[PDB]
Write a protein that binds this ligand. Structure first.
Ligand SMILES: O=C(CCCC[C@@H]1SC[C@@H]2NC(=O)N[C@@H]21)NNc1c(-c2ccc(S(=O)(=O)N3CCOCC3)cc2)cccc1-c1ccc(S(=O)(=O)N2CCOCC2)cc1
Ligand SMILES: O=C(CCCC[C@@H]1SC[C@@H]2NC(=O)N[C@@H]21)NNc1c(-c2ccc(S(=O)(=O)N3CCOCC3)cc2)cccc1-c1ccc(S(=O)(=O)N2CCOCC2)cc1
Lengths: 120, 118, 120, 118
């Protein structure tokens, strides 16, 4: 039930396909949705989750380069998918920017996004 | 110079292919086939040319043909080239949990990789 | 506006006093609030925040030892206070357990708590 | 063994008193001029496990003193390991006061190891 279009609290969108082999592929974009704001995503998920009501673990990465813009950074999301009527993906993320060695200490931001299949 | 074999302080190994397009693809070895896992990620395939590192990230879901930990790790970091190339990362390891345990679902840490085995 | 009794989304309670010198002192407890579940906190906050509508930075620590229990761990919350008739403290936290060197890699949990002055 | 002067890899220094009760109190210096010194306060486990495990601890610095105000605070969470080469291994979170619109980028994360050796 991971496959589909998800929306987070910031208005960002990501469309993902979950493969039988554990692959996650798709696109991550802004609320705008313009070509300039769409980025490739790739990740993995647990294709054989526990049958005890636990969430499904997964992660993905977006490097913030496309054919229009380059922010010289990449975000990874790590979290879990919870299925059902109100399916959700709860994540924490790390956004690392390319930096000089001198600035490396301030290279990585941390936050949390929750995605639903519904747009507020 | 990202493509190749990388070793962490713990002795984890991963071998990765960096596609011209920004793709990272390879395997992560937790130390044997039993301990080999698929990894995929992304990197900046056009980094700044000012001495800045190259941003990247990847994910491993800890399931293979032998074991399933019902968890996934993502590493976020940057590649620094040179005579002593390195990948400096921080990571998030999320386990699949019940809702009641979701507060303790995620570990955080850091890994530095080099192309030299210790 | 930081001084007072706050509740997060787990039901945990923390009572804090914010001193003029930037000190945070008080107690962190469970929803029940019995003696066995109360722990000392101490932290710091920006006693002269920006006057541009920005939050107030702060942080605090609880070591999970009191005179009843000892978890051999400590949590730090890093976040900001946002004033309002609906004031809130948005935080991320790190919970580190004492470990052997072998297990140090899995010593630290990360998460996020939001506190309000109303029970959930 | 926590009480003393500690040095990070970046050359930050901090001087801390560990109270019998679990209190950490002291100062954190960036550069060691007055302009660069800040108050720290935290907590540590004053009755650690006696099984080779580290001692859990954490502390906070709000980056305001009589000279500068960065409108931010860092918390370090980690553990003390004693010995001939005592160390404090930490991860940290640095949160800046921000507008709501920028709150998503309010927090940096990283890691610091401290030793009592300059
Ligand atoms: O790194 C970024 C933003 C990308 C990270 C979004 C994060 S990932 C986790 C969190 N969850 C989300 O969904 N969004 C956020 N900086 N912005 C630049 C971009 C860029 C702009 C828009 C988009 S988007 O597709 O419309 N979308 C926005 C909403 O979030 C999802 C993505 C994507 C990328 C491209 C090039 C450059 C930048 C950039 C970065 C920093 C600065 S700056 O403010 O630091 N600047 C002024 C100060 O001096 C230095 C330069 C300026 C431009
Ligand atoms: O240590 C904890 C959790 C304390 C941190 C709460 C976190 S701080 C961030 C987050 N925000 C919150 O408001 N609460 C959570 N509880 N358990 C205690 C233990 C203990 C810990 C682990 C295990 S175990 O994992 O099961 N283990 C044995 C079995 O094999 C696997 C390993 C066992 C025991 C030891 C001593 C004390 C505690 C404890 C319990 C409750 C509280 S509380 O009632 O004061 N309260 C819990 C929930 O709200 C926060 C405080 C505080 C400490």
């Amino acid at each position: 039930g991971i496959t589909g279009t998800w929306y987070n609290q910031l208005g960002s969108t990501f469309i993902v396909t979950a493969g039988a082999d554990g692959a996650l592929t798709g696109t991550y974009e802004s609320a705008v949705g313009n070509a300039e704001s769409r980025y490739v995503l790739t990740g993995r998920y647990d294709s054989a989750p526990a049958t005890d009501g636990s969430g499904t673990a997964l992660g993905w990465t977006v490097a913030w380069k496309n054919n229009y813009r380059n922010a010289h950074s990449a975000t990874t999301w790590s979290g879990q998918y919870v299925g059902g009527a109100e399916a959700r993906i709860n994540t924490q993320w790390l956004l690392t920017s390319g930096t000089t060695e001198a600035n490396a200490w301030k290279s990585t931001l941390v936050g949390h996004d929750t995605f639903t299949k519904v747009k507020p």
